[PDB]
Amino acid sequence: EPNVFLIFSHGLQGCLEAQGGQVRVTPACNTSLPAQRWKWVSRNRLFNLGTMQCLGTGWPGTASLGMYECDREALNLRWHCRTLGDQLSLLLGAGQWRIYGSEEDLCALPYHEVYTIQGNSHGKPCTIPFKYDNQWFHGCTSTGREDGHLWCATTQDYGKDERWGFCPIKSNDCETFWDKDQLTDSCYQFNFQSTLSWREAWASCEQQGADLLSITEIHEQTYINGLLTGYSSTLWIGLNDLDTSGGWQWSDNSPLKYLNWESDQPDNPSEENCGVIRTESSGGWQNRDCSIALPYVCKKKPKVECEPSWQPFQGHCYRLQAEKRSWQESKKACLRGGGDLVSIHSMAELEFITKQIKQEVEELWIGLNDLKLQMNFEWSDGSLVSFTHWHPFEPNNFRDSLEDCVTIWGPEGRWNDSPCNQSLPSICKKAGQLS
Ligand code: NA
Ligand code: NA
Protein backbone atom coordinates (compact mmCIF):
# COMPACT_ATOMS: atom_id res chain seq x y z
CA GLU A 1 0.00 0.00 0.00
CA PRO A 2 2.45 2.68 -1.25
CA ASN A 3 -0.10 5.08 -2.77
CA VAL A 4 -2.12 5.27 0.45
CA PHE A 5 -1.74 8.30 2.75
CA LEU A 6 -3.15 10.26 5.70
CA ILE A 7 -4.46 13.82 5.39
CA PHE A 8 -3.29 16.22 8.10
CA SER A 9 -4.55 19.73 8.92
CA HIS A 10 -2.14 22.17 10.53
CA GLY A 11 -5.09 24.49 11.15
CA LEU A 12 -7.11 21.88 13.03
CA GLN A 13 -4.15 19.77 14.19
CA GLY A 14 -5.51 16.34 13.26
CA CYS A 15 -6.03 13.80 10.48
CA LEU A 16 -9.08 13.44 8.24
CA GLU A 17 -11.18 10.46 9.29
CA ALA A 18 -14.18 8.66 7.80
CA GLN A 19 -16.69 7.00 10.13
CA GLY A 20 -19.95 5.44 9.01
CA GLY A 21 -20.95 8.02 6.44
CA GLN A 22 -19.36 10.98 8.19
CA VAL A 23 -16.08 12.85 7.89
CA ARG A 24 -14.18 14.43 10.77
CA VAL A 25 -10.75 15.55 11.93
CA THR A 26 -9.31 13.60 14.86
CA PRO A 27 -6.27 14.71 16.85
CA ALA A 28 -5.55 10.99 17.24
CA CYS A 29 -3.63 10.47 14.00
CA ASN A 30 -2.96 6.76 13.51
CA THR A 31 -1.50 5.42 10.27
CA SER A 32 -2.88 1.95 11.03
CA LEU A 33 -6.55 2.96 10.99
CA PRO A 34 -8.05 2.37 7.53
CA ALA A 35 -10.62 5.01 8.51
CA GLN A 36 -7.82 7.55 8.08
CA ARG A 37 -6.24 5.92 5.01
CA TRP A 38 -6.93 7.72 1.73
CA LYS A 39 -5.98 7.10 -1.89
CA TRP A 40 -6.49 8.96 -5.18
CA VAL A 41 -8.38 6.86 -7.73
CA SER A 42 -9.73 7.19 -11.28
CA ARG A 43 -11.95 10.11 -12.32
CA ASN A 44 -10.64 12.49 -9.66
CA ARG A 45 -12.23 10.80 -6.68
CA LEU A 46 -10.71 10.41 -3.22
CA PHE A 47 -11.04 6.90 -1.85
CA ASN A 48 -11.22 5.84 1.80
CA LEU A 49 -9.93 2.37 2.62
CA GLY A 50 -11.82 2.01 5.89
CA THR A 51 -15.26 2.72 4.48
CA MET A 52 -14.41 1.49 0.98
CA GLN A 53 -16.18 4.65 -0.18
CA CYS A 54 -15.50 8.04 -1.78
CA LEU A 55 -15.50 11.55 -0.32
CA GLY A 56 -18.43 13.62 -1.59
CA THR A 57 -20.41 16.83 -1.31
CA GLY A 58 -23.67 18.22 -2.71
CA TRP A 59 -24.28 19.72 -6.13
CA PRO A 60 -25.32 23.39 -6.24
CA GLY A 61 -29.02 23.52 -5.31
CA THR A 62 -29.69 22.22 -1.79
CA ALA A 63 -22.97 21.97 2.03
CA SER A 64 -21.21 19.18 3.92
CA LEU A 65 -18.75 16.31 3.63
CA GLY A 66 -19.79 12.67 3.55
CA MET A 67 -18.86 9.18 2.39
CA TYR A 68 -20.69 7.64 -0.57
CA GLU A 69 -20.59 4.60 -2.85
CA CYS A 70 -18.07 5.51 -5.52
CA ASP A 71 -20.54 5.02 -8.40
CA ARG A 72 -23.05 7.56 -6.98
CA GLU A 73 -23.71 10.46 -9.38
CA ALA A 74 -26.33 12.29 -7.30
CA LEU A 75 -23.41 13.78 -5.40
CA ASN A 76 -20.17 15.47 -6.43
CA LEU A 77 -17.36 13.01 -5.72
CA ARG A 78 -14.76 14.95 -7.74
CA TRP A 79 -11.77 16.64 -6.11
CA HIS A 80 -8.47 18.16 -7.24
CA CYS A 81 -5.29 17.79 -5.18
CA ARG A 82 -4.58 21.51 -5.66
CA THR A 83 -7.92 22.77 -4.33
CA LEU A 84 -8.81 19.94 -1.94
CA GLY A 85 -7.32 21.79 1.04
CA ASP A 86 -9.36 24.91 0.38
CA GLN A 87 -12.50 22.76 0.11
CA LEU A 88 -11.78 20.94 3.36
CA SER A 89 -10.98 24.20 5.18
CA LEU A 90 -14.20 25.65 3.80
CA LEU A 91 -16.46 22.75 4.78
CA LEU A 92 -14.90 22.21 8.22
CA GLY A 93 -14.60 25.89 9.20
CA ALA A 94 -10.79 26.01 9.38
CA GLY A 95 -5.65 25.91 7.40
CA GLN A 96 -2.83 24.21 5.51
CA TRP A 97 -3.37 20.59 4.43
CA ARG A 98 -0.49 18.15 3.95
CA ILE A 99 0.20 14.41 3.83
CA TYR A 100 0.63 13.14 7.39
CA GLY A 101 4.27 12.64 8.36
CA SER A 102 5.61 14.92 5.64
CA GLU A 103 5.82 18.41 4.14
CA GLU A 104 4.42 17.12 0.85
CA ASP A 105 1.19 18.61 -0.46
CA LEU A 106 -1.83 16.49 -1.37
CA CYS A 107 -0.66 16.31 -5.01
CA ALA A 108 2.34 14.14 -4.06
CA LEU A 109 0.73 10.70 -4.54
CA PRO A 110 -1.36 11.05 -7.72
CA TYR A 111 -3.43 8.35 -9.42
CA HIS A 112 -1.62 6.52 -12.22
CA GLU A 113 -3.42 4.67 -15.00
CA VAL A 114 -2.52 0.98 -15.12
CA TYR A 115 -2.88 -0.48 -18.62
CA THR A 116 -4.13 -4.07 -18.94
CA ILE A 117 -2.35 -6.95 -20.65
CA GLN A 118 -4.34 -9.18 -23.02
CA GLY A 119 -7.91 -9.64 -21.74
CA ASN A 120 -10.79 -8.18 -23.76
CA SER A 121 -10.29 -4.43 -23.19
CA HIS A 122 -7.61 -3.67 -25.82
CA GLY A 123 -5.17 -2.36 -23.20
CA LYS A 124 -7.71 -0.02 -21.56
CA PRO A 125 -6.57 0.88 -18.06
CA CYS A 126 -7.96 -0.59 -14.83
CA THR A 127 -10.99 1.30 -13.48
CA ILE A 128 -10.12 2.02 -9.86
CA PRO A 129 -12.19 1.20 -7.85
CA PHE A 130 -14.27 -1.54 -9.47
CA LYS A 131 -17.12 -3.73 -8.21
CA TYR A 132 -16.95 -7.50 -8.64
CA ASP A 133 -19.43 -9.92 -6.99
CA ASN A 134 -20.74 -6.86 -5.15
CA GLN A 135 -17.30 -6.18 -3.63
CA TRP A 136 -15.16 -3.07 -4.22
CA PHE A 137 -11.52 -3.34 -5.26
CA HIS A 138 -9.14 -0.38 -5.24
CA GLY A 139 -6.40 -2.39 -6.91
CA CYS A 140 -5.58 -5.59 -8.78
CA THR A 141 -6.88 -8.93 -7.47
CA SER A 142 -6.67 -12.65 -8.26
CA THR A 143 -10.00 -13.61 -6.62
CA GLY A 144 -12.19 -15.46 -9.11
CA ARG A 145 -9.10 -17.04 -10.69
CA GLU A 146 -7.43 -20.36 -9.95
CA ASP A 147 -4.02 -19.64 -11.49
CA GLY A 148 -3.72 -16.67 -9.15
CA HIS A 149 -2.96 -14.17 -11.90
CA LEU A 150 -3.75 -10.55 -11.03
CA TRP A 151 -6.49 -8.84 -13.02
CA CYS A 152 -8.90 -5.92 -12.92
CA ALA A 153 -12.11 -4.63 -14.51
CA THR A 154 -11.85 -1.82 -17.06
CA THR A 155 -15.26 -0.56 -16.07
CA GLN A 156 -16.43 0.02 -12.50
CA ASP A 157 -19.00 -2.80 -12.70
CA TYR A 158 -17.67 -6.15 -13.89
CA GLY A 159 -20.99 -7.95 -13.31
CA LYS A 160 -22.64 -5.64 -15.83
CA ASP A 161 -20.01 -5.13 -18.56
CA GLU A 162 -17.59 -8.06 -18.14
CA ARG A 163 -14.68 -5.95 -19.44
CA TRP A 164 -11.31 -6.89 -17.94
CA GLY A 165 -7.63 -7.53 -18.40
CA PHE A 166 -4.54 -8.87 -16.69
CA CYS A 167 -2.54 -6.43 -14.57
CA PRO A 168 1.08 -5.63 -15.42
CA ILE A 169 3.74 -7.23 -13.21
CA LYS A 170 7.37 -6.38 -12.53
CA SER A 171 9.00 -9.81 -12.74
CA ASN A 172 12.58 -11.07 -12.74
CA ASP A 173 11.56 -13.71 -15.28
CA CYS A 174 9.76 -13.77 -18.63
CA GLU A 175 7.32 -16.59 -18.00
CA THR A 176 3.60 -16.10 -18.68
CA PHE A 177 3.38 -13.01 -20.90
CA TRP A 178 6.63 -13.06 -22.91
CA ASP A 179 8.31 -14.67 -25.90
CA LYS A 180 11.98 -15.33 -25.06
CA ASP A 181 14.91 -15.44 -27.47
CA GLN A 182 17.02 -18.37 -26.30
CA LEU A 183 20.17 -17.05 -27.97
CA THR A 184 20.19 -13.63 -26.28
CA ASP A 185 17.91 -14.24 -23.27
CA SER A 186 15.94 -11.14 -24.27
CA CYS A 187 12.17 -11.15 -23.73
CA TYR A 188 9.53 -9.70 -26.03
CA GLN A 189 5.82 -9.03 -25.65
CA PHE A 190 3.64 -8.44 -28.72
CA ASN A 191 0.36 -6.84 -27.63
CA PHE A 192 -1.51 -7.39 -30.91
CA GLN A 193 -4.93 -6.81 -29.35
CA SER A 194 -4.10 -3.57 -27.50
CA THR A 195 -4.68 -0.07 -28.88
CA LEU A 196 -2.57 2.45 -26.99
CA SER A 197 -0.82 5.72 -27.80
CA TRP A 198 2.98 5.72 -27.88
CA ARG A 199 3.23 7.40 -24.49
CA GLU A 200 0.56 5.05 -23.16
CA ALA A 201 2.43 2.06 -24.59
CA TRP A 202 5.63 3.45 -23.05
CA ALA A 203 3.96 3.63 -19.62
CA SER A 204 2.61 0.08 -20.04
CA CYS A 205 6.05 -1.35 -20.80
CA GLU A 206 7.58 0.66 -17.95
CA GLN A 207 5.15 -0.56 -15.30
CA GLN A 208 6.09 -4.12 -16.29
CA GLY A 209 9.74 -3.27 -15.55
CA ALA A 210 10.46 -3.08 -19.28
CA ASP A 211 10.70 -0.60 -22.16
CA LEU A 212 9.35 -0.33 -25.70
CA LEU A 213 11.10 -2.53 -28.24
CA SER A 214 14.54 -1.46 -29.39
CA ILE A 215 16.10 -3.15 -32.44
CA THR A 216 19.85 -2.89 -32.09
CA GLU A 217 21.22 -5.83 -34.13
CA ILE A 218 20.58 -7.33 -37.55
CA HIS A 219 19.73 -10.58 -35.75
CA GLU A 220 17.25 -8.85 -33.44
CA GLN A 221 15.39 -7.58 -36.50
CA THR A 222 15.25 -11.09 -37.92
CA TYR A 223 14.06 -12.71 -34.70
CA ILE A 224 11.38 -10.02 -34.41
CA ASN A 225 10.23 -10.33 -38.03
CA GLY A 226 10.14 -14.04 -37.42
CA LEU A 227 7.48 -13.96 -34.75
CA LEU A 228 5.52 -11.49 -36.89
CA THR A 229 5.23 -13.63 -40.05
CA GLY A 230 1.57 -14.56 -40.63
CA TYR A 231 0.25 -11.71 -38.49
CA SER A 232 -0.90 -8.47 -40.08
CA SER A 233 -0.06 -5.60 -37.76
CA THR A 234 1.49 -2.18 -37.12
CA LEU A 235 3.09 -1.88 -33.67
CA TRP A 236 4.74 0.93 -31.70
CA ILE A 237 8.45 0.55 -31.04
CA GLY A 238 10.72 2.65 -28.81
CA LEU A 239 11.94 4.81 -31.69
CA ASN A 240 11.29 8.56 -31.54
CA ASP A 241 12.62 12.07 -32.20
CA LEU A 242 10.63 13.83 -29.46
CA ASP A 243 13.69 15.43 -27.81
CA THR A 244 15.43 16.64 -30.99
CA SER A 245 13.66 16.65 -34.35
CA GLY A 246 15.37 14.27 -36.76
CA GLY A 247 17.46 13.02 -33.85
CA TRP A 248 16.04 9.51 -33.68
CA GLN A 249 16.55 7.69 -30.38
CA TRP A 250 15.42 4.49 -28.69
CA SER A 251 13.34 5.11 -25.57
CA ASP A 252 15.64 2.67 -23.71
CA ASN A 253 18.64 4.85 -24.71
CA SER A 254 20.10 2.15 -26.98
CA PRO A 255 22.46 3.36 -29.72
CA LEU A 256 21.01 3.93 -33.18
CA LYS A 257 23.46 1.51 -34.84
CA TYR A 258 20.92 -0.56 -36.78
CA LEU A 259 18.32 0.89 -39.15
CA ASN A 260 15.48 -0.54 -41.22
CA TRP A 261 13.42 2.46 -42.31
CA GLU A 262 11.12 1.74 -45.23
CA SER A 263 12.18 3.33 -48.51
CA ASP A 264 10.20 6.56 -48.11
CA GLN A 265 10.77 6.91 -44.35
CA PRO A 266 10.98 8.82 -42.17
CA ASP A 267 8.80 11.64 -43.50
CA ASN A 268 6.38 14.30 -42.22
CA PRO A 269 8.93 15.57 -39.67
CA SER A 270 6.36 18.13 -38.49
CA GLU A 271 3.73 15.61 -37.32
CA GLU A 272 5.20 12.09 -37.09
CA ASN A 273 7.64 11.58 -34.19
CA CYS A 274 7.27 7.91 -33.18
CA GLY A 275 8.36 4.62 -34.70
CA VAL A 276 6.32 1.61 -35.80
CA ILE A 277 7.21 -1.81 -37.19
CA ARG A 278 5.06 -3.19 -39.99
CA THR A 279 4.30 -6.69 -41.25
CA GLU A 280 3.33 -5.40 -44.70
CA SER A 281 6.90 -4.31 -45.39
CA SER A 282 8.15 -7.54 -43.81
CA GLY A 283 9.32 -5.61 -40.77
CA GLY A 284 10.06 -2.18 -42.18
CA TRP A 285 9.98 0.90 -39.99
CA GLN A 286 7.66 3.84 -40.35
CA ASN A 287 7.30 7.03 -38.34
CA ARG A 288 3.79 8.03 -37.23
CA ASP A 289 1.69 10.41 -35.16
CA CYS A 290 2.51 9.48 -31.56
CA SER A 291 -1.06 10.12 -30.39
CA ILE A 292 -2.54 7.42 -32.64
CA ALA A 293 -3.69 4.22 -30.88
CA LEU A 294 -1.89 1.02 -31.87
CA PRO A 295 -0.70 -2.36 -30.61
CA TYR A 296 2.88 -2.37 -29.32
CA VAL A 297 5.95 -4.40 -28.44
CA CYS A 298 7.67 -4.36 -25.07
CA LYS A 299 11.15 -5.61 -24.29
CA LYS A 300 13.10 -6.57 -21.20
CA LYS A 301 16.28 -8.45 -20.31
CA PRO A 302 15.93 -10.30 -16.98
CA LYS A 303 45.33 8.77 -16.16
CA VAL A 304 47.89 7.83 -18.83
CA GLU A 305 50.92 9.11 -20.76
CA CYS A 306 51.08 9.22 -24.56
CA GLU A 307 53.69 9.24 -27.32
CA PRO A 308 54.71 12.62 -28.74
CA SER A 309 52.04 14.24 -30.98
CA TRP A 310 49.25 12.31 -29.21
CA GLN A 311 46.96 13.70 -26.49
CA PRO A 312 45.57 11.76 -23.51
CA PHE A 313 41.96 11.49 -22.40
CA GLN A 314 40.77 9.01 -19.81
CA GLY A 315 42.69 5.84 -20.76
CA HIS A 316 43.50 6.48 -24.41
CA CYS A 317 45.61 8.59 -26.73
CA TYR A 318 44.12 10.67 -29.55
CA ARG A 319 45.66 12.28 -32.64
CA LEU A 320 44.53 14.29 -35.65
CA GLN A 321 45.58 13.17 -39.12
CA ALA A 322 45.25 16.42 -41.04
CA GLU A 323 46.02 14.88 -44.42
CA LYS A 324 42.86 14.22 -46.43
CA ARG A 325 42.41 10.52 -47.30
CA SER A 326 39.54 8.09 -47.92
CA TRP A 327 38.01 6.23 -44.96
CA GLN A 328 39.89 3.00 -45.72
CA GLU A 329 43.19 4.81 -46.34
CA SER A 330 42.64 6.89 -43.19
CA LYS A 331 42.29 3.64 -41.26
CA LYS A 332 45.40 2.10 -42.85
CA ALA A 333 47.36 5.16 -41.76
CA CYS A 334 46.07 4.83 -38.18
CA LEU A 335 47.13 1.16 -38.08
CA ARG A 336 50.66 1.97 -39.25
CA GLY A 337 50.73 4.40 -36.33
CA GLY A 338 49.84 1.52 -34.02
CA GLY A 339 46.23 2.59 -33.54
CA ASP A 340 42.86 2.65 -35.28
CA LEU A 341 40.18 5.12 -36.35
CA VAL A 342 38.71 6.70 -33.23
CA SER A 343 35.85 4.93 -31.46
CA ILE A 344 33.56 7.02 -29.26
CA HIS A 345 31.65 5.53 -26.34
CA SER A 346 30.53 8.48 -24.21
CA MET A 347 29.52 12.10 -24.47
CA ALA A 348 32.59 13.21 -22.51
CA GLU A 349 34.90 11.42 -24.95
CA LEU A 350 33.03 13.08 -27.82
CA GLU A 351 33.46 16.52 -26.25
CA PHE A 352 37.19 15.95 -25.83
CA ILE A 353 37.58 14.79 -29.43
CA THR A 354 35.56 17.72 -30.76
CA LYS A 355 37.04 20.51 -28.65
CA GLN A 356 40.62 19.27 -28.32
CA ILE A 357 41.41 17.15 -31.39
CA LYS A 358 39.05 18.19 -34.20
CA GLN A 359 38.91 21.87 -33.25
CA GLU A 360 38.31 23.92 -36.41
CA VAL A 361 38.72 21.09 -38.90
CA GLU A 362 35.23 21.02 -40.46
CA GLU A 363 34.63 17.31 -41.11
CA LEU A 364 36.70 14.16 -40.54
CA TRP A 365 36.52 10.34 -40.42
CA ILE A 366 35.86 8.21 -37.36
CA GLY A 367 35.79 4.41 -36.98
CA LEU A 368 32.06 3.78 -37.45
CA ASN A 369 31.03 1.99 -40.64
CA ASP A 370 28.75 -0.67 -42.19
CA LEU A 371 31.10 -2.22 -44.79
CA LYS A 372 30.58 -5.76 -43.46
CA LEU A 373 26.76 -5.69 -43.30
CA GLN A 374 24.89 -2.64 -44.58
CA MET A 375 22.45 -0.75 -42.33
CA ASN A 376 24.36 -2.24 -39.37
CA PHE A 377 27.07 0.07 -38.02
CA GLU A 378 30.19 -1.12 -36.18
CA TRP A 379 33.50 0.37 -35.03
CA SER A 380 36.55 -0.50 -37.13
CA ASP A 381 38.52 -1.28 -33.94
CA GLY A 382 35.97 -3.99 -33.11
CA SER A 383 34.81 -2.12 -29.99
CA LEU A 384 31.20 -2.36 -28.81
CA VAL A 385 28.84 0.25 -30.24
CA SER A 386 27.24 1.68 -27.09
CA PHE A 387 26.92 5.31 -28.18
CA THR A 388 25.80 7.19 -31.29
CA HIS A 389 25.50 10.94 -31.87
CA TRP A 390 23.95 11.32 -35.31
CA HIS A 391 23.09 14.65 -36.87
CA PRO A 392 19.36 15.12 -37.48
CA PHE A 393 18.13 12.87 -40.33
CA GLU A 394 21.38 10.92 -40.32
CA PRO A 395 22.39 8.31 -41.18
CA ASN A 396 20.99 8.21 -44.72
CA ASN A 397 23.70 7.03 -47.11
CA PHE A 398 22.48 3.43 -47.17
CA ARG A 399 19.61 5.09 -49.06
CA ASP A 400 22.03 5.39 -51.99
CA SER A 401 25.45 3.77 -51.73
CA LEU A 402 26.06 0.22 -50.57
CA GLU A 403 28.97 1.24 -48.31
CA ASP A 404 28.58 3.88 -45.59
CA CYS A 405 31.32 5.34 -43.40
CA VAL A 406 30.93 7.92 -40.67
CA THR A 407 32.35 11.40 -40.03
CA ILE A 408 32.22 14.02 -37.29
CA TRP A 409 30.65 17.12 -38.79
CA GLY A 410 30.62 20.70 -37.45
CA PRO A 411 31.15 22.26 -33.96
CA GLU A 412 28.57 20.17 -32.04
CA GLY A 413 30.48 16.99 -32.86
CA ARG A 414 27.45 15.22 -34.34
CA TRP A 415 27.89 12.50 -36.96
CA ASN A 416 27.11 12.02 -40.64
CA ASP A 417 27.38 8.94 -42.79
CA SER A 418 28.86 9.27 -46.26
CA PRO A 419 30.39 7.33 -49.13
CA CYS A 420 33.83 6.13 -48.05
CA ASN A 421 34.94 7.59 -51.40
CA GLN A 422 35.21 11.04 -49.79
CA SER A 423 38.60 12.62 -49.01
CA LEU A 424 38.95 13.91 -45.46
CA PRO A 425 41.27 14.23 -42.48
CA SER A 426 40.73 11.73 -39.66
CA ILE A 427 41.29 11.03 -35.97
CA CYS A 428 43.19 8.08 -34.53
CA LYS A 429 42.92 6.30 -31.21
CA LYS A 430 45.22 3.90 -29.37
CA ALA A 431 45.66 2.74 -25.78
CA GLY A 432 47.83 4.82 -23.47
CA GLN A 433 50.45 3.83 -20.91
CA LEU A 434 49.84 4.19 -17.17
CA SER A 435 51.32 6.01 -15.25
NA1 NA B 1 5.67 8.41 -41.94
NA1 NA C 1 24.58 10.90 -44.90
Residue numbers in the entry: 40 to 101, 105 to 136, 156 to 363, 379 to 511
Mind quoting what the paper says about this structure?
The C-type mannose receptor and its homolog Endo180 (or uPARAP, for urokinase plasminogen activator receptor-associated protein) mediate the endocytic uptake of collagen by macrophages and fibroblasts.
We obtained two crystal forms of the natively glycosylated D1-4 region, one of which diffracted to 2.5 Å resolution and allowed the structure to be determined. The overall structure of Endo180 D1-4 is the same in both crystal forms (the root-mean-square deviations [rmsd] between the four crystallographically independent copies range from 1.2 to 1.4 Å) and only the high-resolution structure is described in the following. We have determined the crystal structure at 2.5 Å resolution of the N-terminal region of Endo180, consisting of a ricin-like domain, a fibronectin type II (FN2) domain, and two C-type lectin (CTL) domains. The inter-domain interfaces are sizable (ricin-FN2, 552 Å2; FN2-CTL1, 674 Å2; CTL1-CTL2, 662 Å2), suggestive of a stable arrangement with limited inter-domain flexibility. There is no electron density for residues 101–104 and 137–155 in the ricin-like domain and residues 364–378 in the CTL1-CTL2 linker. No Ca2+ ions were present in our crystallization solution, but we observed electron density for a metal ion (most likely Na+) in each CTL domain in a position corresponding to the canonical Ca2+ “site 2” (Weis et al., 1998). Comparison with a typical Ca2+-loaded CTL domain structure suggests that the Endo180 D1-4 crystal structure is unlikely to change much upon Ca2+ binding.
